[PDB]
């Protein structure tokens, strides 16, 4: 069982990072135009 | 043309339009809304349900109502000059008289009012889709206030005009009828929910689509009333859902006629099922189940669980709920879990 744990955590992690690191660079600009 | 003289006055665009409908709609729609309030605050049902109705008795807004008549009555329309009260407001008041009353006047008020749509939309000149949409409601009321009672025992068992009064009606159904398990009612639900979902999906789907066709930071001054064309671009909003929830609209013409269906529709559904409860002809059991349950102390489904509730919400109820059928319930006899 325990072996699965980590696999699962990793995945979870791999993503959040994708969520956080991702939402960071090139965002407040992510739209059509800024007026 | 005296006929046109009366007509003439009637349908004359007053402040709050009167109309031919006005001669039916308005009176009944009065003593009803009225009668409710009248008994709500002055009359007791103590001689039919030995319970307090009016605010005078001490009752609370929630705990007040014009309780249906004693089942001893039947479906007799308790006329004031009805052999029941023999003609006597005070008694006729005590024998529940107001019920058949409130119900029937409201009956004709609901009639008079649906006709209140057909009149206007025909003068003003528009599709009869409003009045048509009133079918949903005439059904609901008709199903749960006349047919139900009529096909059952007394006028008694019919809903009673109040809050806690109908709240009862609810549990009642969950109990000996197990309404919650009916295909129909499970659709009424479908309507009354989605219809609301729509009412809002579209509601705020609008407030957040429209354009800057006004100046300030508030949308109230924004164009209208009917001038410039359309506030929300049904295209810019479209691609919003077609990419979020997968599928969106096109053609506000239908989105405005599917908004009608949804509720007026589902609401009619239940109304049918409800007629089914008249003849107790309801959806209570799942044969395939009771039989597989009978011979196996190890098979339990929510269904059975729910099913046990009923007995509970019935054994304890009925007696003090159905006074006229002198229920005598020993302490033992009464079902109930262990320790509670």
């Amino acid at each position: 069982m325990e072996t699965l744990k980590i696999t699962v955590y990793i995945v979870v992690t791999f993503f959040v990072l994708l969520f956080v690191f991702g939402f960071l660079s090139g965002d407040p600009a992510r739209n059509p135009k800024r007026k | 043309g005296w006929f046109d003289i009366l007509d003439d006055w009637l349908k004359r665009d007053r402040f709050v339009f009167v109309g031919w409908s006005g001669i039916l709609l308005f009176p009944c729609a009065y003593l009803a809304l009225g009668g409710w309030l009248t008994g709500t605050t002055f009359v007791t049902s103590w001689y039919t349900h030995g319970l307090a109705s009016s605010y005078l008795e001490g009752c609370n807004f929630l705990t007040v109502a014009v309780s249906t008549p004693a089942n001893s009555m039947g479906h007799s329309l308790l006329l004031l000059w009805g052999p029941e009260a023999q003609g006597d407001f005070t008694r006729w008041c005590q024998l529940g008289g107001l019920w058949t009353f409130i119900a029937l006047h409201g009956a004709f008020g609901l009639i008079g009012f649906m006709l209140r749509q057909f009149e206007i939309a025909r003068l003003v000149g528009v599709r009869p889709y409003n009045a048509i949409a009133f079918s949903a409601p005439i059904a609901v009321f008709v199903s749960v206030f006349l047919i139900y009672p009529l096909g059952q025992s007394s006028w008694f068992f019919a809903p009673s005009f109040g809050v806690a009064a109908i709240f009862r009606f609810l549990l009642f159904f969950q109990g000996f009828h197990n309404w919650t398990l009916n295909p129909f009612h499970m659709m009424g639900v479908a309507g009354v929910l989605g219809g609301a979902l729509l009412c809002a999906i579209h509601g705020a789907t609008v407030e957040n689509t429209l354009f800057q066709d006004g100046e300030g930071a508030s949308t109230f001054r924004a164009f209208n009333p009917t001038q410039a064309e359309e506030t929300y671009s049904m295209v810019t909003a479209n691609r919003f859902w077609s990419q979020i929830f997968g599928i969106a609209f096109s053609n506000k013409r239908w989105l405005h006629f599917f908004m009608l269906f949804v509720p007026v529709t589902g609401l009619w559904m239940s109304a049918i099922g409800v007629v089914g409860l008249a003849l107790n002809l309801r959806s209570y059991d799942f044969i395939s189940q009771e039989i597989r349950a009978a011979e196996d102390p190890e098979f339990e489904t929510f269904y059975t669980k729910n099913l046990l509730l009923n007995e509970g919400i019935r054994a304890w109820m009925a007696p003090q709920d159905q006074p006229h059928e002198n229920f005598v319930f020993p302490e033992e006899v009464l079902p109930r879990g262990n320790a509670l």
Partner: protein, 447 residues
């Protein structure tokens, strides 16, 4: 001169672009209002608390707080003198003056702009540091209070400890816990049933010895935001609108109301059951505890008493293999408190201590928490949903849990509100889209 130039009415409020001393004296307005309730209702409780009758059977929540620090305490928790309560109550109503008085000043006769007149007390939302500055400042003002307790538990009258050696009795915390891990640990783990983020605080030192760790953190924070302009990444993200700032610091609170409502609902320590009510779980355990006792006395053997479900009538094993009351109370096995702990052992309940060490007092305390449970009725009617009209108490812990939630909830939808629109200012969608250049009209429509 507004409403025509100002946007809307209901939303009429909110005028403020670079600066405004009106909204200044408006936060210094309302924020006075708050001080008023503090003292207003306080004086409304002391004006009630019967000589001696459960601090919770009376609608008291402000008092119950002032108590936990140790003002009017009493070996057991029984108020000793209805005076400390009064001191704050008025020191507030009076306090409502200063914080109130000048509130109405900056609001009508106060100088609008904060640039034309003063220049240090004048901001501008786009001003990155002015903003980043004031921050650490109020941060510093928190690091201060963050130390009163330190000095309230260590010097001016320790807190009321319901985990004292002989019974509840305001002792003075002398050994605050300064072990960076245990204190930095709490937050660092425990999310669910096993334990709570921070809702799980065994002793009153892990708190004092910890509030110390925070009174510094936010303090050494002023010396940082005050002393510093944004770093290099956060420039991006974190849109710097005035409105947005409202959300930024808003949805925080929403998170706090939640992490709040929980503390009162569960916590036994910072929320002594003696001043407030008996934590829900504590109630459920009171039940079994009682009937376990009522029964053992009748001559029964809880140790071997076989349940009706076949599980354990009074006791059973836990997924950890420990002993815990039975029936349904298993739902609350994680719960802990002073009246049971001694009647506890090395593997969970101890069949020995549970047979004779069952000291007399516990049976009753264990009783009170049974009768008085975190359940009631809107119109205050204590007892299960369907109890006759007689007792009418409704637990404070029940009241603080509910209340806050409704608030902390809405707030979360309140943060959405602004943090989502304010994303449209620095974008200009806020007011809709432009009738001529709608950004979707220039996109390769997927189909």
């Amino acid at each position: 001169d507004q409403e025509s130039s100002g946007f809307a009415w209901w939303a009429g409020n909110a005028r403020l672009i670079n600066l405004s001393g009106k909204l200044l004296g408006a936060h210094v307005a309302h924020a006075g209002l708050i001080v008023f309730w503090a003292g207003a209702m306080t004086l409304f409780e002391l004006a009630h608390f019967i000589p001696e009758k459960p601090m919770y059977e009376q609608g008291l929540i402000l008092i119950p707080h002032i108590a936990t620090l140790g003002w009017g305490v009493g070996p057991g928790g029984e108020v000793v003198d209805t005076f400390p309560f009064f001191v704050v109550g008025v020191v507030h109503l009076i306090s409502s003056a200063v914080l109130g008085f000048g509130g109405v000043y900056h609001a009508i006769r106060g100088p609008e702009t904060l640039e034309e007149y003063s220049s240090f007390f004048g901001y501008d939302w786009k001003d990155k540091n002015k903003m980043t500055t004031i921050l650490g400042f109020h941060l510093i003002v928190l690091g201060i209070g963050a130390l009163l307790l330190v000095a309230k538990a260590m010097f001016f009258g320790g807190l009321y400890d319901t985990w004292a050696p002989g019974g509840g009795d305001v002792r003075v915390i002398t050994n605050p816990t300064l072990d960076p891990r245990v204190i930095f640990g709490y937050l660092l783990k425990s999310p669910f049933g096993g334990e709570g983020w921070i809702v799980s605080v065994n002793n009153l030192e892990d708190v004092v010895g910890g509030h110390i760790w925070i009174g510094l953190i936010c303090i050494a924070g002023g010396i940082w935001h005050i002393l510093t302009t944004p770093f290099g990444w956060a420039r991006r993200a974190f849109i710097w609108s005035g409105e947005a700032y409202l959300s930024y610091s808003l949805g925080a609170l929403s998170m706090m109301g939640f992490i709040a409502t929980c503390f009162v609902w569960f916590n036994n320590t910072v929320y002594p059951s003696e001043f407030y009510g008996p934590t829900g779980p504590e109630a459920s355990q009171a039940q079994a505890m009682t009937f376990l006792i009522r029964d053992q006395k009748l001559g029964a053997n809880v140790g071997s008493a076989q349940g009706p479900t076949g599980l354990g009538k009074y006791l059973m094993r836990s997924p950890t293999g420990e002993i815990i009351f039975g029936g349904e109370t298993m739902r609350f096995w994680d719960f802990r408190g002073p009246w049971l702990e001694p009647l506890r052992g090395p593997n969970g309940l101890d069949l020995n201590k549970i047979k004779n060490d069952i000291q007399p007092w516990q049976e009753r305390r264990a009783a009170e928490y049974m009768t008085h449970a975190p359940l009631g009725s809107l119109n205050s009617v204590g007892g299960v949903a369907t109890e006759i009209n007689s007792v009418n108490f409704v637990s404070p812990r029940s009241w603080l849990a509910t209340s806050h939630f409704v608030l902390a909830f809405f707030f979360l939808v309140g943060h959405l509100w602004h943090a989502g629109r304010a994303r449209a200012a620095a974008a200009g969608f806020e007011k809709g889209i432009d009738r001529e250049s709608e950004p979707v009209l220039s996109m390769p429509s997927l189909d």
